[PDB]
Amino acid sequence: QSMMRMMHSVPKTMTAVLLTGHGGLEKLVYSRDVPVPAPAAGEVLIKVTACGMNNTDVWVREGAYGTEDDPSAVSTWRRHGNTLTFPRIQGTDTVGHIVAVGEGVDRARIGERVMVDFSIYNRDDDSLADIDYMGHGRDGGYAEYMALPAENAHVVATDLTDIELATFCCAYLTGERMLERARLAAGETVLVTGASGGVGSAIIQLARARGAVPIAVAGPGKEAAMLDIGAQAVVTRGQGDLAEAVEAASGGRPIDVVADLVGGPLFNDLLKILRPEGRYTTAGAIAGPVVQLDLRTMYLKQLELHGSSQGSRADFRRLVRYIEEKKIRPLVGGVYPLSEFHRAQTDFMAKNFVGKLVVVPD
Amino acid sequence: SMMRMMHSVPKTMTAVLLTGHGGLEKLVYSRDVPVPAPAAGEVLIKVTACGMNNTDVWVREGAYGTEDDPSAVSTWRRHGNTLTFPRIQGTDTVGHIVAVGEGVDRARIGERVMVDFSIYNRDDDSLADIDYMGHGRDGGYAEYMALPAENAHVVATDLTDIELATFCCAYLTGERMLERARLAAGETVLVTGASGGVGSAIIQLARARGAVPIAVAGPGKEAAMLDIGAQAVVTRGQGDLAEAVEAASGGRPIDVVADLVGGPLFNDLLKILRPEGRYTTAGAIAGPVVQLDLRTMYLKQLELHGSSQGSRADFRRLVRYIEEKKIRPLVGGVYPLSEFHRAQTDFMAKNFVGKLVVVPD
Numbered sequence: 001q002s003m004m005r006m007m008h009s010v011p012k013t014m015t016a017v018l019l020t021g022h023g024g025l026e027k028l029v030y031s032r033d034v035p036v037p038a039p040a041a042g043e044v045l046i047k048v049t050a051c052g053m054n055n056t057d058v059w060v061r062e063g064a065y066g067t068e069d070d071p072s073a074v075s076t077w078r079r080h081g082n083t084l085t086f087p088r089i090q091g092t093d094t095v096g097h098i099v100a101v102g103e104g105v106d107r108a109r110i111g112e113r114v115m116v117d118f119s120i121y122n123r124d125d126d127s128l129a130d131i132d133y134m135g136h137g138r139d140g141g142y143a144e145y146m147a148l149p150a151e152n153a154h155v156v157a158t159d160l161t162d163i164e165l166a167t168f169c170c171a172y173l174t175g176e177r178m179l180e181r182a183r184l185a186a187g188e189t190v191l192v193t194g195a196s197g198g199v200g201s202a203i204i205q206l207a208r209a210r211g212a213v214p215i216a217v218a219g220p221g222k223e224a225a226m227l228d229i230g231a232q233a234v235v236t237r238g239q240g241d242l243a244e245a246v247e248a249a250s251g252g253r254p255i256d257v258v259a260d261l262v263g264g265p266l267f268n269d270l271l272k273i274l275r276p277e278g279r280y281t282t283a284g285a286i287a288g289p290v291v292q293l294d295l296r297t298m299y300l301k302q303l304e305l306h307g308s309s310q311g312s313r314a315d316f317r318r319l320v321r322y323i324e325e326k327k328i329r330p331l332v333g334g335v336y337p338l339s340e341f342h343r344a345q346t347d348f349m350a351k352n353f354v355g356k357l358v359v360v361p362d
Numbered sequence: 363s364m365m366r367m368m369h370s371v372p373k374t375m376t377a378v379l380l381t382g383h384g385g386l387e388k389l390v391y392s393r394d395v396p397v398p399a400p401a402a403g404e405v406l407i408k409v410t411a412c413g414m415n416n417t418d419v420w421v422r423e424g425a426y427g428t429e430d431d432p433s434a435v436s437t438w439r440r441h442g443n444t445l446t447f448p449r450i451q452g453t454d455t456v457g458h459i460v461a462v463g464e465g466v467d468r469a470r471i472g473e474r475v476m477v478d479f480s481i482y483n484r485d486d487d488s489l490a491d492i493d494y495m496g497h498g499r500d501g502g503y504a505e506y507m508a509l510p511a512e513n514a515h516v517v518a519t520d521l522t523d524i525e526l527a528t529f530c531c532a533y534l535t536g537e538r539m540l541e542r543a544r545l546a547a548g549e550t551v552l553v554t555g556a557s558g559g560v561g562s563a564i565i566q567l568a569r570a571r572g573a574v575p576i577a578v579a580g581p582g583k584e585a586a587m588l589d590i591g592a593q594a595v596v597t598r599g600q601g602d603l604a605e606a607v608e609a610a611s612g613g614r615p616i617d618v619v620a621d622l623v624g625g626p627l628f629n630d631l632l633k634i635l636r637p638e639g640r641y642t643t644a645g646a647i648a649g650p651v652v653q654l655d656l657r658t659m660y661l662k663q664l665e666l667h668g669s670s671q672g673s674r675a676d677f678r679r680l681v682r683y684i685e686e687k688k689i690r691p692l693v694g695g696v697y698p699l700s701e702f703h704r705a706q707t708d709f710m711a712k713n714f715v716g717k718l719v720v721v722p723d
């Protein structure tokens with residue numbers, strides 16, 4: 001109810017799931033007396049109400065990004081500026097309520113429901129060369145409270161639940177950038193692999209949002225779900241030749257863009273399917289990331305391959321705008337209490353669900 | 363005199379024939395090849411020079427492979443085989459119009475022309491259905507060649523016939539690479555296989571456009587690279603490349619990599635490229651099949667572009683570059699058509715700089 005009580009209900013210690021080093025789930029410790037951060041100059045402090053799970057959670061913990069010299073070495077994604085320090089609270093897709101504010105900040109902001117932009121840009125221009133993110137370079141949302149810069153706490157003009165709002169920021173920002181890098185236009189066709197996953201699903205929605213035609217490549221039993229989120233046609237990964245199946249599901253239209261989230265043994269086939277002068281784009285490869293590329297296929301077909309992470313401020317604004325105009329919708333695949341993080345991430349890794357899993361403090 | 367000229371054009375000629383896929387025994391020097399009659403909209407030229415390109419060798423070998431098998435025997439056009447044997451190869455053709463076909467001005471006879479090897483196959487500027495002369499159609503390794511009239515360009519230059527046979531395939535390819543990588547004035551390009559055709563072309567073309575080229579080349583080729591406009595030269599076989607390039611540039615970042623080598627250099631090239639950088643290729647002489655770490659591409663926000671040949675607009679610009687003397691010919695050797703096996707043996711070993719030229723006789 002009251003704003004004053006809220007301001008003074010903020011405890012000195014809190015509950016949080018801590019990442020304590022690289023390795024397996026046992027490296028994630030549920031702790032009961034972690035210092036509540038104090039908002040520095042230009043920061044707010046939010047009471048976390050929801051936080052959405054992403055692949056980067058898992059890969060950062062495993063150290064599964066490899067290095068340029070050794071693709072199987074353990075490393076965080078930030079290969080050249082390691083800002084990961086242990087213990088670290090992970091969690092990128094944070095929603096909460098501002099309960100405290102730091103030095104330069106308007107005290108009128110207290111009480112606001114905010115969606116966190118997880119991005120640390122590290123530049124004033126629109127370059128993505130030095131990016132980092134909350135949950136990697138700085139503590140994230142798998143805790144009861146989180147500090148973050150005021151500019152990053154967005155008030156969204158929407159009637160959605162805190163949980164619903166927590167589904168968007170990492171995967172949909174990443175989705176948008178991919179679609180922007182590939183220059184996907186109204187009326188074009190995008191083939192989306194890993195379509196039932198975080199980014200996959202988002203791209204299907206974001207494709208629709210900009211007037212494009214998505215065709216999902218989905219696991220067995222996930223077809224009807226892909227249709228539900230706006231896919232034009234679905235191709236089941238299991239059986240058949242992919243190229244034939246894509247041909248039939250497309251009804252003949254050539255594939256302008258491939259959005260790949262799987263990679264691995266699928267990669268070469270996607271380059272085969274892609275129309276000449278077509279564009280390939282990726283921000284993750286779950287199957288995975290080291291592929292055999294026949295340069296000749298790339299240049300005889302006049303192809304572009306694009307790799308992309310996260311997104312720009314303008315991309316984020318557009319995402320906020322999409323949420324507000326309801327051009328995309330939240331996909332809640334399940335909800336887990338913070339106290340049951342191990343169960344949450346096990347379920348997360350299995351991927352026997354659609355859309356996104358959300359972690360709530362308790 | 364005028365009548366004499368209508369009938370003085372021989373009915374047979376000599377030409378090097380590609381008879382099938384294989385080694386050099388597939389190139390038969392033949393003295394009795396029918397001289398093509400020019401069809402509607404065509405000219406017939408007396409070839410005086412023709413430049414050598416990697417495609418000659420690769421089409422001969424069928425070393426393009428297939429989508430399903432990277433090492434199957436295959437010509438470059440994997441989805442429309444217009445290569446029929448015997449074929450006369452040779453892309454970079456210069457000559458003199460001796461005859462004109464059905465809808466074409468008689469006045470053109472006597473003109474000195476540079477052949478545009480491109481078969482566009484579309485009205486628009488899409489390269490999706492391209493072919494070339496010397497592959498889809500007979501090329502310039504012959505005394506005479508027929509071609510569409512509009513692909514026969516009178517260039518406004520005092521350049522020698524041999525000099526002019528330096529440009530069209532490698533420089534069109536290079537232009538497109540730069541176009542596809544969006545290389546802007548002030549930006550730095552790292553060019554590998556820099557002493558070869560496309561390599562050298564890109565060095566010149568980057569300067570033509572205000573960019574700063576850094577050459578990666580063979581041992582003892584530093585001086586030749588500087589002479590054709592390279593800012594700095596890195597010598598390929600002496601130390602870590604990233605460190606060498608580091609030292610070679612001002613420490614300044616690499617915006618674009620133009621790669622014609624691939625193979626063992628590929629992953630290294632991706633390391634060196636600045637985040638948000640652009641990689642562009644049209645051939646990989648040291649190995650076209652490479653292991654790519656998608657993580658490197660996506661964490662670094664990279665683009666990779668594959669490109670081949672170029673557009674009509676790209677070609678017009680090339681002519682302009684030649685006329686305005688913004689680029690110059692790099693003749694590395696001239697060879698007679700009768701000694702083709704020697705010419706290609708030299709061509710394949712790359713112990714030269716610039717382009718190799720085959721003159722009939």
Ligand SMILES: [Cl-]
Pocket residue numbers: 283284285286288289657
């Ligand atoms: Cl990955």
Ligand SMILES: [Cl-]
Pocket residue numbers: 296644645646647650
């Ligand atoms: Cl190649």
